[PDB]
């Protein structure tokens with residue numbers, strides 16, 4: 049999908065996680081988030097169209113999705129442990145990574 | 155899967171592409187390669203276990219899979235155009251990227 | 261996904277079909293369209309939140325996706341016959357069905 | 367699949383749900399039911415082959431699968447809440463919807 | 473699925489192959505056949521419920537699906553070579569294997 | 579995949595099961611094992627390349643995967659019952675079947 053649709057997927061599933069009433073919903077939403085972040089990490093955003101693939105900006109953009117995906121997976125592990133509230137709190141913390149990328153490259 | 159199993163998947167499917175007799179086989183194998191490279195780009199290899207995630211080494215390791223995946227996708231586009239020989243030749247060129255990573259980090 | 265994300269999926273894949281250079285791309289995009297239309301036909305749109313499920317409006321809304329999905333499948337059959345231009349022309353004709361629903365319920 | 371195979375899938379999975387000993391089995395079976403009902407709602411049954419797609423009969427036939435799918439999803443939510451007995455009881459109630467369609471159109 | 477539903481899947485997809493107008497349909501149907509045969513080879517049929525798993529009957533029953541799956545895959549290879557008529561003729565030949573099993577164990 | 583890659587998949591997932599901290603991990607790993615065993619049961623191993631498909635050796639090789647898959651499924655049922663330790667103990671017992679095949683045919 050387009051990068052912007054991956055972003056809508058990330059945003060909508062974060063909301064599902066916040067309002068989830070059970071572990072299965074949190075796991076389902078985190079899985080959809082892992083997939084969207086995977087589809088996005090290789091894209092090139094608008095504000096970076098004019099840059100060498102090896103530009104530290106592109107490398108930094110990637111690192112951001114690398115960090116996000118690591119955090120998504122850690123929250124998913126908590127959900128697999130049936131620690132629903134802890135998984136939801138970890139999902140909240142993701143937003144720091146969303147925000148840090150958006151501040152630089154959105 | 156473990157990083158080493160992703161590597162076996164990449165290696166075996168390159169061989170299928172070389173010996174393929176039709177576009178469907180080349181597409182199938184390139185698809186399996188995209189998936190293995192996706193599963194690998196987030197891993198941390200042995201020779202790099204002692205490094206900051208932001209270490210230019212980890213960033214470089216990622217860039218290598220970024221490059222590989224771009225080339226896999228370009229070869230896949232050729233196969234979707236039914237340009238089997240051209241796709242096979244592009245698959246050959248991938249090995250430069252395999253080799254460059256292995257020289258540094260394997 | 262939310263109804264609005266199904267709509268983004270339909271819109272983006274129509275654009276891929278228009279600019280496609282081969283049958284595989286058209287088939288891939290039509291498949292993603294079938295799936296989005298399937299995810300949408302059971303939803304309830306905003307302008308209809310206040311209506312009996314059996315309201316002729318909800319029945320009409322459904323009929324619209326029923327028609328759309330039939331047309332998506334017919335275009336997909338053309339693509340499976342490798343009739344790329346004909347499939348692209350059929351994809352264009354879909355927009356009449358998009359438009360007719362939007363005029364009533366969007 | 368043919369409409370009659372979707373019906374066999376619905377019937378067999380209802381039986382699995384009745385005899386299930388755990389939530390995972392109920393969820394698995396309800397998921398297979400959602401998929402079969404999705405594959406069926408767009409079909410046209412024998413006793414209706416001679417009717418305008420907009421015939422209130424075809425619209426009614428669709429509404430029946432719309433209702434069924436809503437009930438399947440509600441039972442699935444109960445199973446995700448680990449309310450196995452409640453999910454099984456909701457699966458029983460589905461049969462009212464099966465029966466009402468069959469009385470008219472089977 | 474139940475063994476009898478795997479059999480319905482095999483039967484219906486053979487019919488799709490006979491009436492197919494393009495390679496994609498033949499491949500799609502053969503793929504569904506491979507999956508049904510995979511789901512069946514491990515089952516135990518009624519007329520054999522009273523037999524040691526190592527009974528030469530169970531071993532023979534398995535061999536039959538082993539043979540069938542090999543033939544399904546060979547027909548699929550022909551379809552990937554875009555040899556539609558040859559794939560359809562190979563699909564016809566499958567029925568010898570269906571028949572031989574049914575004569576013994578159905 | 580090649581038979582040897584199916585074997586790596588079986589081996590790696592057994593290790594995940596041993597070190598699992600929750601049911602979801604055990605189920606995920608057992609599912610990957612079922613799939614690898616399914617991909618392997620139809621192969622022909624090196625030490626048997628020179629044998630009639632109906633050779634009691636090939637029939638015996640198959641029986642071994644038949645037994646393995648039955649045991650994988652039984653362990654999976656325990657995991658679906660949330661009996662994690664019991665599922666892990668059943669996964670241990672699988673190794674008897676791995677070993678018996680390897681002694682004869684590896």
Ligand code: HEC
Pocket residue numbers: 051052055056058059062093094109110111112113116142143145146147149150153154
């Ligand atoms: C970089 C490493 C990013 C991370 C991590 C996340 N996002 Fe993002 N996002 C990023 C960019 C470069 C853009 C602009 C894309 C464009 O086409 O302009 C966005 C955009 C969004 C949007 C708005 C989409 C739109 O309609 O234009 C949303 C709602 C959004 N991003 C959400 C989001 C969330 C919730 C994330 C973490 C869970 C997240 N993004 C991560 C870059 C990056």
Ligand code: HEC
Pocket residue numbers: 157158161162164165168199200215216217218219222248249251252253255256259260
């Ligand atoms: C880094 C960016 C790499 C790219 C691109 C590719 N490979 Fe690789 N590979 C890499 C590492 C760090 C390692 C060592 C992993 C370990 O556990 O030691 C490997 C290993 C292999 C192997 C051997 C696996 C084994 O049995 O130990 C193979 C056969 C292999 N890699 C193949 C391969 C191919 C064909 C690639 C391109 C198509 C490729 N790799 C890319 C790192 C990287």
Ligand code: HEC
Pocket residue numbers: 263264267268270271274305306321322323324325328354355357358359361362365366
């Ligand atoms: C009813 C039967 C519809 C059919 C067929 C299609 N669409 Fe639609 N669409 C419909 C509604 C009720 C809405 C409003 C949803 C809302 O939340 O307000 C929409 C919306 C769109 C949009 C805008 C999405 C947004 O960002 O708000 C787009 C781009 C769109 N729809 C596209 C689209 C296409 C391309 C279709 C056919 C291929 C199509 N829609 C069909 C209802 C219906």
Ligand code: HEC
Pocket residue numbers: 369370373374376377380411412427428429430431434460461463464465467468471472
């Ligand atoms: C209409 C909205 C239906 C709903 C809801 C369900 N079924 Fe159905 N079913 C319907 C029709 C029109 C038919 C006849 C199809 C034909 O080819 O004649 C059927 C058939 C069945 C059958 C028999 C299949 C056969 O072997 O001929 C079964 C066992 C069956 N249906 C089961 C079933 C169940 C369990 C349902 C709810 C969970 C259900 N159906 C819903 C139409 C509709």
Ligand code: HEC
Pocket residue numbers: 475476479480482483486517518533534535536537540566567569570571573574577578
């Ligand atoms: C054994 C190795 C078989 C092979 C190969 C195939 N079939 Fe079969 N089939 C087999 C059995 C033991 C049974 C009886 C199952 C039962 O529950 O009684 C069947 C049954 C069928 C049926 C009828 C299903 C029903 O409604 O009762 C059909 C239509 C059928 N089988 C078709 C079929 C086809 C087309 C096959 C090859 C492509 C095929 N079967 C292979 C055992 C075996």
Ligand code: HEC
Pocket residue numbers: 581582585586588589592623624639640641642643646672673675676677679680683684
């Ligand atoms: C026969 C019925 C087998 C069963 C059951 C299992 N394995 Fe196996 N395995 C088998 C063969 C014939 C071979 C040799 C394949 C070859 O190409 O030489 C193997 C090999 C392995 C290996 C080594 C793979 C390699 O790198 O060469 C491993 C690690 C292995 N098998 C593991 C394994 C496990 C864990 C099993 C049960 C859970 C298992 N195998 C079952 C044949 C059979």
Ligand SMILES: [Fe+3]
Pocket residue numbers: none
């Ligand atoms: Fe659970």
Ligand SMILES: [Fe+3]
Pocket residue numbers: none
């Ligand atoms: Fe083709």
Ligand SMILES: [Zn+2]
Pocket residue numbers: 049050272273276
């Ligand atoms: Zn797109």
Ligand SMILES: [Zn+2]
Pocket residue numbers: 068069070073443
């Ligand atoms: Zn809920």
Ligand SMILES: [Zn+2]
Pocket residue numbers: 155156590591594
């Ligand atoms: Zn692993």
Ligand SMILES: [Zn+2]
Pocket residue numbers: 158159162163582583586587
């Ligand atoms: Zn391996």
Ligand SMILES: [Zn+2]
Pocket residue numbers: 174175176179549
């Ligand atoms: Zn070939």
Ligand SMILES: [Zn+2]
Pocket residue numbers: 060061064261262
């Ligand atoms: Zn949502």
Ligand SMILES: [Zn+2]
Pocket residue numbers: 052053056057264265268269
């Ligand atoms: Zn969107």
Ligand SMILES: [Zn+2]
Pocket residue numbers: 231280281282285
């Ligand atoms: Zn293209």
